[PDB]
Coordinates of all heavy atoms in Angstrom, one line a residue:
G30 N -50.6 5.6 129.4 CA -49.6 6.4 128.6 C -50.2 7.4 127.7 O -50.1 7.4 126.5
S31 N -50.9 8.4 128.4 CA -51.6 9.4 127.7 C -50.6 10.2 126.8 O -50.8 10.5 125.6 CB -52.3 10.3 128.7 OG -52.0 10.0 130.0
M32 N -49.6 10.7 127.5 CA -48.5 11.5 126.8 C -47.4 10.5 126.3 O -47.0 9.6 127.1 CB -47.9 12.5 127.7 CG -48.9 13.6 128.2 SD -48.1 15.1 128.7 CE -49.3 16.3 128.1
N33 N -47.0 10.6 125.1 CA -46.0 9.8 124.5 C -44.6 10.3 124.8 O -44.3 11.4 124.4 CB -46.2 9.7 123.0 CG -45.8 8.3 122.5 OD1 -44.6 8.0 122.2 ND2 -46.7 7.4 122.3
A34 N -43.9 9.6 125.6 CA -42.5 10.0 126.1 C -41.5 10.1 125.0 O -40.9 11.1 124.8 CB -42.1 9.1 127.2
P35 N -41.4 9.0 124.1 CA -40.4 9.0 123.0 C -40.7 10.2 122.0 O -39.8 10.9 121.7 CB -40.6 7.7 122.3 CG -41.2 6.8 123.4 CD -42.0 7.7 124.2
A36 N -42.0 10.3 121.7 CA -42.4 11.4 120.7 C -42.1 12.8 121.3 O -41.7 13.7 120.5 CB -43.8 11.2 120.4
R37 N -42.3 12.9 122.6 CA -42.1 14.2 123.2 C -40.7 14.7 123.0 O -40.5 15.9 122.7 CB -42.4 14.1 124.7 CG -43.7 14.6 125.2 CD -44.1 14.0 126.5 NE -45.0 15.0 127.3 CZ -44.4 15.8 128.3 NH1 -43.1 15.8 128.5 NH2 -45.3 16.6 128.9
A38 N -39.7 13.9 123.2 CA -38.3 14.3 123.1 C -37.9 14.4 121.6 O -37.1 15.2 121.2 CB -37.4 13.3 123.8
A39 N -38.5 13.5 120.7 CA -38.2 13.5 119.3 C -38.7 14.7 118.6 O -38.0 15.4 117.9 CB -38.7 12.2 118.7
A40 N -40.0 15.0 118.8 CA -40.7 16.1 118.1 C -40.4 17.4 118.8 O -40.9 18.5 118.3 CB -42.2 15.8 118.0
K41 N -39.7 17.4 119.9 CA -39.4 18.6 120.7 C -38.8 19.6 119.9 O -39.1 20.8 120.0 CB -38.5 18.2 121.9 CG -39.0 18.9 123.2 CD -37.9 19.9 123.6 CE -38.5 21.3 123.9 NZ -37.4 22.3 124.0
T42 N -37.8 19.3 119.0 CA -37.1 20.2 118.2 C -38.0 20.8 117.2 O -37.9 22.0 116.8 CB -35.9 19.4 117.5 OG1 -35.5 18.3 118.2 CG2 -34.7 20.4 117.3
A43 N -39.0 20.1 116.7 CA -40.0 20.6 115.7 C -40.9 21.6 116.4 O -41.2 22.7 115.9 CB -40.8 19.5 115.1
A44 N -41.3 21.3 117.6 CA -42.1 22.2 118.4 C -41.4 23.4 118.8 O -41.9 24.5 118.9 CB -42.6 21.4 119.7
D45 N -40.1 23.2 119.0 CA -39.2 24.4 119.4 C -39.1 25.4 118.3 O -39.3 26.6 118.5 CB -37.8 23.8 119.7 CG -37.4 23.8 121.2 OD1 -37.9 24.7 121.9 OD2 -36.6 23.0 121.6
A46 N -38.9 24.9 117.1 CA -38.8 25.8 115.9 C -40.1 26.5 115.6 O -40.2 27.6 115.3 CB -38.4 25.0 114.7
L47 N -41.2 25.7 115.8 CA -42.6 26.3 115.6 C -43.0 27.3 116.7 O -43.8 28.2 116.4 CB -43.6 25.1 115.5 CG -44.2 24.9 114.1 CD1 -43.4 23.9 113.4 CD2 -45.6 24.5 114.2
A48 N -42.3 27.1 117.9 CA -42.6 28.0 118.9 C -42.0 29.4 118.6 O -42.5 30.4 119.2 CB -42.0 27.5 120.2
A49 N -41.1 29.5 117.7 CA -40.5 30.7 117.3 C -41.6 31.6 116.5 O -41.7 32.8 116.7 CB -39.3 30.5 116.4
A50 N -42.3 30.9 115.6 CA -43.3 31.5 114.9 C -44.6 31.7 115.7 O -45.3 32.7 115.5 CB -43.6 30.7 113.6
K51 N -44.9 30.7 116.5 CA -46.0 30.8 117.4 C -45.9 32.0 118.3 O -47.0 32.6 118.7 CB -46.2 29.5 118.2 CG -47.1 28.5 117.5 CD -47.3 27.3 118.4 CE -47.1 26.0 117.6 NZ -48.0 24.9 118.0
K52 N -44.7 32.3 118.7 CA -44.4 33.5 119.5 C -44.9 34.8 118.8 O -45.7 35.5 119.5 CB -42.9 33.6 119.8 CG -42.4 34.9 120.4 CD -41.7 35.8 119.5 CE -40.3 35.2 119.1 NZ -40.2 35.0 117.7
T53 N -44.6 35.0 117.6 CA -45.0 36.1 116.8 C -46.5 36.1 116.6 O -47.1 37.2 116.6 CB -44.3 36.1 115.5 OG1 -43.3 35.1 115.4 CG2 -43.6 37.5 115.3
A54 N -47.1 35.0 116.5 CA -48.5 34.8 116.3 C -49.3 35.4 117.5 O -50.2 36.2 117.4 CB -48.9 33.4 116.1
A55 N -48.8 35.0 118.7 CA -49.3 35.5 120.0 C -48.9 36.9 120.2 O -49.7 37.7 120.7 CB -48.8 34.6 121.1
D56 N -47.7 37.3 119.8 CA -47.2 38.6 120.0 C -48.0 39.6 119.3 O -48.3 40.7 119.8 CB -45.8 38.7 119.5 CG -45.2 40.1 119.5 OD1 -44.8 40.6 120.6 OD2 -45.2 40.8 118.5
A57 N -48.5 39.3 118.1 CA -49.3 40.2 117.3 C -50.6 40.5 118.0 O -51.1 41.7 117.9 CB -49.7 39.5 115.9
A58 N -51.1 39.6 118.8 CA -52.3 39.9 119.6 C -51.9 40.6 120.9 O -52.5 41.7 121.3 CB -53.0 38.6 120.0
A59 N -50.9 40.1 121.6 CA -50.5 40.7 122.9 C -50.0 42.2 122.7 O -50.4 43.0 123.5 CB -49.3 39.8 123.5
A60 N -49.1 42.4 121.8 CA -48.6 43.8 121.6 C -49.6 44.7 121.1 O -49.5 45.9 121.1 CB -47.4 43.7 120.6
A61 N -50.7 44.1 120.5 CA -51.8 45.0 120.0 C -52.7 45.4 121.2 O -53.5 46.3 121.1 CB -52.6 44.2 119.0
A62 N -52.6 44.7 122.3 CA -53.3 45.0 123.5 C -52.5 45.8 124.5 O -52.9 46.9 124.9 CB -53.8 43.7 124.2
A63 N -51.3 45.3 124.9 CA -50.5 45.9 125.8 C -49.6 46.9 125.1 O -48.4 46.7 124.9 CB -49.7 45.0 126.6
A64 N -50.1 48.0 124.6 CA -49.4 49.1 124.0 C -49.8 50.4 124.5 O -49.2 51.4 124.1 CB -49.7 49.0 122.5

């Protein structure tokens, strides 16, 4: 059980919200290259 199944679904919402900010973090790099 390398990946935790219960935790995956539970913390999913937290990861979802953080993916919003992580998007901009990656975007700052990507948009600085592909411009």
Side-chain angles (χ1 to χ4, degrees):
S31 8
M32 297 204 146
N33 215 273
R37 257 159 148 265
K41 222 247 129 192
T42 335
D45 253 329
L47 251 91
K51 267 183 229 219
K52 172 250 290 118
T53 352
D56 174 80

